Amino acid sequence: SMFRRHTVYLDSYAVINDLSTKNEGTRLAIKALELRFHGAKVVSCLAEGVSHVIIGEDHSRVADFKAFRRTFKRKFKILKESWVTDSIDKCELQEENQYL
Amino acid sequence: MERKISRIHLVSEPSITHFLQVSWEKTLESGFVITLTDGHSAWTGTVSESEISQEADDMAMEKGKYVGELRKALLSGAGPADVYTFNFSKESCYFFFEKNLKDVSFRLGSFNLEKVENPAEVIRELICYCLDTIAENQAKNEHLQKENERLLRDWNDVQGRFEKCVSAKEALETDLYKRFILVLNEKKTKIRSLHNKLLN
Amino acid sequence: MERKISRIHLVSEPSITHFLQVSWEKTLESGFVITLTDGHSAWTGTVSESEISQEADDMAMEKGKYVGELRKALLSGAGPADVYTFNFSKESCYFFFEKNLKDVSFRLGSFNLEKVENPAEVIRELICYCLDTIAENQAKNEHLQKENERLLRDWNDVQGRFEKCVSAKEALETDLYKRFILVLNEKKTKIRSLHNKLLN
């Protein structure tokens, strides 16, 4: 239940807020599955309730997320895939500042 | 522009092997250009749809079966038991191929090839095409091997993660009941205290 | 026993591309036999430990690095920034290649070749080796494709199993929590009812 109060949105869709564009990622799908297994909340639609964002090696969408978060009242955080892996390995929530 | 290179042994010269190159645009039915070479001389001929249709009509069978036999013979697609004999008269440049069957033979086909003034050009083209296809196949094999290695690594990692999670599931299953028991025991202790106070 | 065949462009006749094949037993250190083919005529030569050592001695460079350059040049290992120019004096059958870097030439080797009476056998061997390499590469490609398909199917099955496991875990947690919270609410209502009697 470590990720109970930390909702995570993953860049598994080429176009945001569009279910018809599901990607065939390899690491991303497994990481999302594990994160939801550990109690995290994963939403296919990016709404105002999103608090954390996970992006893989694809750095092309970083600018899009940085532009979107400006309009959002609460700005989310973009974290690398290493944060969740380290959290599972150490069995506690690592600080995101080292993976932002 | 599909192409196929095969090695054949003419009955006239069984001590050496000749190379037959067959090139067709879309399918063997439409037509194909064949070239027979031996490293010193080359003979190039062409066969069109009309010639194939006439040969099939003369042999009195469906076009599909004749095309299949031609594919099995010229393109080296022979089955486990299929013997094809290729004869080539160099003086007349007449190249025919037949199917051997026990003690009988069928004149499957015949063409009239013509010599090319520069066999070196065609030999070089054939060798260059062979090298190019070899390189392309090697690159494709390397890419496939890399993909397979990556898939194996990812599968192993996911298997380990699943192995951990399956046991974590039962761990949580056991922990939840104990937590509920503790909280309910505390609440029942409060209930007992209140009941005793009321009794007093 | 292995060999490598590459395309070599002569400065004298850049239009026609020759084919240079180099074959060795275990490594270039022991030696290698080279053959230059054009399509109508061929030339053959050999190099051994003594010849390569002599060729390295006259130049102030390490033998290992020298054989490295020889491998980079003759086996088509030149990179984008590496350019090599070859010359083959037919009259004297004298072969030599140099490296063109920063607009200055530098000799790398000087081989002596001997013409072959029959050039129709070397070409036949080259074509047969190319066909065998194509066949083995195709077989390897088919095997790799089958392995890739199997690995993809296994990965998909594992992902489906993981999804099923996580769904089952979430359902179990939700059911247990709903049951526990209902029991806790019942206990809380009992507590409130008992406390309501204190004021009375």
Curated annotation (Swiss-Prot), chain A:
Residues 1-100 form the BRCT domain. Testis, thymus, prostate and heart. It comes from the Eukaryota. It is found in: Nucleus. Belongs to the ATP-dependent DNA ligase family. Interacts with XRCC4; the LIG4-XRCC4 subcomplex has a 1:2 stoichiometry and XRCC4 is required for LIG4 stability. Component of the core long-range non-homologous end joining (NHEJ) complex (also named DNA-PK complex) composed of PRKDC, LIG4, XRCC4, XRCC6/Ku70, XRCC5/Ku86 and NHEJ1/XLF. Additional component of the NHEJ complex includes PAXX. Following autophosphorylation, PRKDC dissociates from DNA, leading to formation of the short-range NHEJ complex, composed of LIG4, XRCC4, XRCC6/Ku70, XRCC5/Ku86 and NHEJ1/XLF. Interacts with DCLRE1C; the interaction is direct. Interacts with APLF. DNA ligase involved in DNA non-homologous end joining (NHEJ); required for double-strand break (DSB) repair and V(D)J recombination. Catalyzes the NHEJ ligation step of the broken DNA during DSB repair by resealing the DNA breaks after the gap filling is completed. Joins single-strand breaks in a double-stranded polydeoxynucleotide in an ATP-dependent reaction. LIG4 is mechanistically flexible: it can ligate nicks as well as compatible DNA overhangs alone, while in the presence of XRCC4, it can ligate ends with 2-nucleotides (nt) microhomology and 1-nt gaps. It is linked to LIG4 syndrome: Characterized by immunodeficiency and developmental and growth delay. Patients display unusual facial features, microcephaly, growth and/or developmental delay, pancytopenia, and various skin abnormalities. This is DNA ligase 4. It comes from Homo sapiens (Human). The lineage of its organism: Eukaryota, Metazoa, Chordata, Craniata, Vertebrata. The gene is LIG4. The chain holds residues 811 to 910 of 911 of the full protein.
From Swiss-Prot, chains B, C:
Keywords: Chromosome, Coiled coil, Cytoplasm, Disease variant, DNA damage, DNA recombination, DNA repair, DNA-binding, Dwarfism, Isopeptide bond, Nucleus, Phosphoprotein, Ubl conjugation. Changing residue 106 to E: Abolished interaction with NHEJ1/XLF. Its main location: nucleus. Residues 180-200 are annotated as: Interaction with LIG4. Phosphorylations by PRKDC at the C-terminus of XRCC4 and NHEJ1/XLF are highly redundant and regulate ability of the XRCC4-NHEJ1/XLF subcomplex to bridge DNA. Phosphorylation by PRKDC does not prevent interaction with NHEJ1/XLF but disrupts ability to bridge DNA and promotes detachment from DNA. Monoubiquitinated. Widely expressed. The modification Phosphoserine is found at residues 53, 193. Belongs to the XRCC4-XLF family. XRCC4 subfamily. It is linked to Short stature, microcephaly, and endocrine dysfunction: A disease characterized by short stature and microcephaly apparent at birth, progressive postnatal growth failure, and endocrine dysfunction. In affected adults endocrine features include hypergonadotropic hypogonadism, multinodular goiter, and diabetes mellitus. Variable features observed in some patients are progressive ataxia, and lymphopenia or borderline leukopenia. This is DNA repair protein XRCC4. The chain holds residues 1 to 200 of 336 of the full protein.
